[PDB]
């Protein structure tokens, strides 16, 4: 890495060291080659496309390469970031806008669902509270796949739509806001939750089963009213309680000093556009992105990070 | 053209006029010569085949030239109907037959699906209601391609199947019905639909996705026309789909409401008998013994025989 | 035949007999002659190859005549065997070995695909369940050509492979298996199948048409799922069934008095060889064989048959 990180590997791998180490170091020396080569192809395919564009007459197919690029960056991202990131919990909620905000929440949930099916990920709905119009008042689900969290972490934040409400006939543009919170699933062996700290409750499913778990120390509360049995429900409430717990703990250990708009992205239907505001990137393939083709935007985010965040000059 | 529609072209084309008229009339000048040539190729080729039948020992290969007759006639239709017949909306539902009827609906959907692919057109499924036996309760879909509407317009009507049902173990021959409705797509600039005349509702999908994902219903308050969708699309996308269908539907309903107000059933448009492997179209009484090939998508033989007749007497001809 | 089967013909062709019998007995005589002439050509070109070997200096061409016998044997086989027609149904499926078995199953399907093209035969694939890596979970196809069934009837049995999986880089030699089943197609007139013994079902395509047919008494079941229409597929299923049924009968009336390993042939890649075990013959042109140049092996199997089977002392 740099050649500096690859220097230690040049020497370490020298004639001496222990078996448990030669594999340890050699294995990483290879990890660096992939990285080295992957960025190689990235940079080649990049410099390549810039020729297909202004070759006196662009060859409308820099899209075959443009796509591969989005692909090379998610691979690089995977090799770079210290590894445990394949399981994630997603929660989406309406924001400002009323009936319209819950409708956008479903639009998002629809994007992610269709995204999952395209990356070959597995998705399970932990819970969903719909709205008469066909919106969502709350939804939390689990996504697992090669780098699911590593990629979805980019979706955390406030999303806003700009569009004329569908049941509104030719009315005025409406701006609503939805919240997406992504967290990494925390296995049982990775965090301690004492029995006496937990308070479990169950009730008739207000008008299949309804459960609620309270982590007394924290005060975190997990409530589920779905089709799983009480027993099964409890296990699902716990998967979520851990992630929510671990986070709150992370938070309680960093936010005691950290002491709004924060719109992370905007979708505009009349313009059929998507603008992620951390990178100031705009795309005009809104419907295809909302249809589940989110790589173009995430890969851009991944690049910006690998170009001037942690893994760059570090 | 004729010699007449070519007359006005002769004079108009004369010395002076306006630029925008030169290319204009000039462009219409060519239209007629090609029309004249194609009708010349058809005649030269038609009159050539009939000599290859009783020459003293036929040359079973008239089919090769026969296949070009189907193509020349469609090229002639494209030149005789220069308007805007490139976008169409198709709808297929079961007629009488029960399960068997919903199965024939699919056989047709497949046929048009593969027929589309062969003409290299673009097809998009608006919506589909399938049946357990792998059949179709209802299906609607758009098709855009070179004069793809002027070609699929002859498919509107009832289509009847004659055959032993697949699940019926070699038993008796059954006869079911399937209904095809082909409407030309209508643009927003060509028909007015006032905001206040539209009621749009949206509901939860009925039984990760839940049922399907989104449900939209659009009602044209005046006429009563209702367009309902339940499919993978989003609300925003189904509405634009529902609106595409509603324009086509309303434009059709107004044409009827203007004729059906001065013009005051069986209508078996065509037949698909499997035991005999034939397909007979009843408006032209043309028959083919290439059933499965036609069902597999090679439909041109029949539509051209329909165009030929159509042009052989209707508007295009004596008009 | 012998001079015996011929004797009777000679006398039946004496002074009298009927028109329809005249031609009938007249053709089999000539048939017999052809058998005699070919059985002679075979015998001489043979006695001529041996001489070309230990003559005083082999003339490396005993192969041009070697290939001639490949032909003569098949023409003999034609003239001899039971009417064994020009139509055949072949089925191939993985044996033991996991993915590798599936991959070798397609290997075999390729050999035959290529072999049939060399024999000028026609070939329609009835169905094919494929594997991501490119193997074949299952396949049945139809073949038609001058006694394609007779010549292919010797492929029925378990085929075994020994090689390093292509996806393994310089690994250990893995060994697998693939089953091949050949059946002579039965025309509807030839076999009786009552309507009340079939159970024909249909379903929607999971993820064109789906069709399954069951022969209630036997338990035989043919599934179909492809681009075909329910109707075409049903007809494609009745062909395969009449074959599965007929055979099952020729069996159920022999597999009732005939009271595993049955490794029919072995293809070893490192040593580049094909070893047919029923005759213990080894060819060293494995690849040319897997490419469809099967006449070598089959003509050997044909020569053993005529030599010790019915067609001999009988």
UniProtKB/Swiss-Prot annotation, chain B:
Subcellular location: Cytoplasm
Pfam families: PCRF, RF-1
InterPro entries cross-referenced by the UniProt entry: PCRF, Pep_chain_release_fac_I, Pep_chain_release_fac_I_sf, Prokaryotic/Mito_RF, RF-1
Keyword Membrane in annotation: no
SUPFAM superfamilies linked: Release factor
Keyword field: Cytoplasm, Methylation, Protein biosynthesis
Molecular function terms, GO-annotated: translation release factor activity, codon specific
Regions annotated as coiled coil: none
Keyword DNA damage: no
GO cellular component, one term: cytoplasm
Post-translational modification as stated in the protein's UniProt record: Methylated by PrmC. Methylation increases the termination efficiency of RF1.
UniProt similarity note: Belongs to the prokaryotic/mitochondrial release factor family.
Biological function: Peptide chain release factor 1 directs the termination of translation in response to the peptide chain termination codons UAG and UAA.
Protein name, as recorded: Peptide chain release factor 1
